[PDB]
Structure formats: structure tokens, C-alpha cells
Amino acid sequence: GSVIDPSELTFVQEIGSGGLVHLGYWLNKDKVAIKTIEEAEVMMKLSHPKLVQLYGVCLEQAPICLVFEFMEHGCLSDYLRTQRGLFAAETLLGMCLDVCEGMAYLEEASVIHRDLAARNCLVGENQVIKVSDFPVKWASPEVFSFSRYSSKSDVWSFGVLMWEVFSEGKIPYERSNSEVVEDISTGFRLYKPRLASTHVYQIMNHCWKERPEDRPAFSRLLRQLAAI
Ligand SMILES: Cc1cc(Nc2nn(C3CCOCC3)c(=O)c3cc(CN4CCN(C)CC4)ccc23)[nH]n1
């Protein structure tokens, strides 16, 4: 079921902190990411090729850990920055499309990410991007002011992620939390990255409408991104 026996796992090496994350092996054969600290039951039901898959929970261990799909190229944020200068626009679009497909699935499943950013996406084989772990610089106005989350607040975050992707891992509003709040509150928006076309930038700006009701749903964004 949802439970992985501790003897089925091998801890190989720490690969980073989220807390602690290890590269491991599952049944001595398969690479997995082991994340040590009923929501988990919901999480396992969330199966999509553009979502990092939760394979199971190891309960008979302290502290308990979660066993995930292993993504060999690490965080999208890191990968964009290290590979900066090597990206064609078409590849960057594909990365946004990947994320949008994962997010459309979550939207349809009534799951709000709440912290969508390039740092929370992972890079796999053939440069596939998957959404993981389902922060004012990614927050919509209604979130940072009133904690009003929805798939539409995730859409705002996705617009910022699009910007991260097309700017090859630049830090958005590279300003304090108070200053970003006051920038966004007054109508300021991230300027267009060089590699983003006029068309891509209008999609971005549609994600950044002040009102959640004026932002497109991920279902609509997916049609728009696929139509390019
Ligand atoms: C859940 C989950 C996490 C993963 N893999 C990796 N996660 N993280 C962080 C993800 C967020 O939590 C902290 C760990 C890394 O940092 C990382 C780093 C590498 C190695 N890099 C990339 C390839 N370069 C050539 C060398 C350096 C490989 C895999 C990963 N799969 N599933």
C-alpha cells in the first residue's frame, strides 16, 4: 500500500536540504530521493508524468521519510543558472509547458501548490521538468495581504516561474519583502526577459492580473502554451 519497509531502502548520500534529502536505492536497484523530516494518501493518488511521484512512506523509522522519484539534474532554478547561455527559446517554452501540464493536473484535482517556483521544480531525463513539493516574490496580491490561496494564486506564481525560466534563472525583483509588496500593490510588473517573445510576455502578464478572477486557469494556459 502506502508503506515502504525500512529494509527496502539504502541511504547513499545527502544531496541537499529542503529537511534532509538523500539519494538512495529502493530494493537495491532503483535510484530514489529519500526525504526525511492522511495527507500522504492524497499525495500518492496524485499521479502525473509532470509531477514528481511519491512512491511511498517509510513509517517504521524515526524520523519518518517519504520516498520520491529521483530527478537526476536537481532543481530547475540551479539548472537554469548553471546552463545559462545554452538555452533556445523553444526549450524554455517546453519547460513552461511541462510545469503547466503538472499544474493543470493539480488544479483539476483541487490541489493548491502554494509555493510554486523554479526552486520547487526538478529536472529529469531529456530535460523534462516536473513540479515538486506540492516567499513574497512569487505571491499574488491576495496571498501576501490576506493569505487567500487558490489555483489562481498558483497561476500568479506560475507567471513568475515563466519569468525565471525565460530569464535563465534570474532572481525576480532582485528587493525586500516590504518593497515587493508595495511594488506589486501599485501595479509594477516584472519586465520582459530577452528570450521571451511578445506573445509569451502577454501570457506572463495575464498571470499577473491583480484580480484572481482575471487570471487564466491552468487549463486555459495549457491550451495557450501548446498553441505556440
Ligand atoms: C524529491 C527529489 C529530489 C531529487 N533530486 C535532487 N534533488 N535536489 C534538491 C531538491 C530539493 O530538496 C533538496 C535536494 C538536488 O539538489 C539534487 C542535486 C543533484 C546533483 N546536481 C545536479 C546535476 N549536476 C550535474 C550535479 C549537481 C541531483 C539530484 C538532486 N529527485 N527527487
Q: What is the DSSP string of 109-160?
A: TT---S--SGGGEEE-GGG-EEE----GGG--HHHHHH----HHHHHHHHHH
Resolution in A: 1.7
Q: Which fold has domain 73-228?
A: Transferase(Phosphotransferase); domain 1 (1.10.510)
**In Å, what is the CA distance from 186 to each residue of 152, 177, 179, 182, 189?**
19, 14, 11, 6, 9
> If we measure between CA atoms, which residue out of 82, 85, 71 comes closest to residue 15?
71
Q: Is 135 exposed, middle or buried (0-12, 13-18, 19+ CB in 10 A)?
A: middle
Q: Which fold has domain 1-72?
A: Phosphorylase Kinase; domain 1 (3.30.200)
Cα(74) to centroid of ligand 1, in Å? Answer: 3
Domain boundaries, the chain: 1-72, 73-228
Backbone angles phi, psi at 83, to 5 degrees: -100, 5
Residue pointed to by grid coordinates 517509510: 58
Q: Which residues contact 179 (CB under 8 A, 6 or more apart)?
A: 173
**Ligand 1 atom, smallest distance to 71 CA:** 31
**35 assigned to a ligand binding site:** yes
Report the side by side order of strands in the sheet with 54-58: 9-17, 20-26, 30-36, 65-69, 54-58
Q: Looking at this protein, which amino acid is placed at residue 9?
A: L
- Nine-digit cell string for 63: 524520523
CA atoms within 13 A on the CB side of 72: 7
- Nine-digit cell string for 103: 499544474
**21 assigned to a ligand binding site:** yes
The helix (run of H) or strand (run of E) holding residue 68 is: strand 65-69
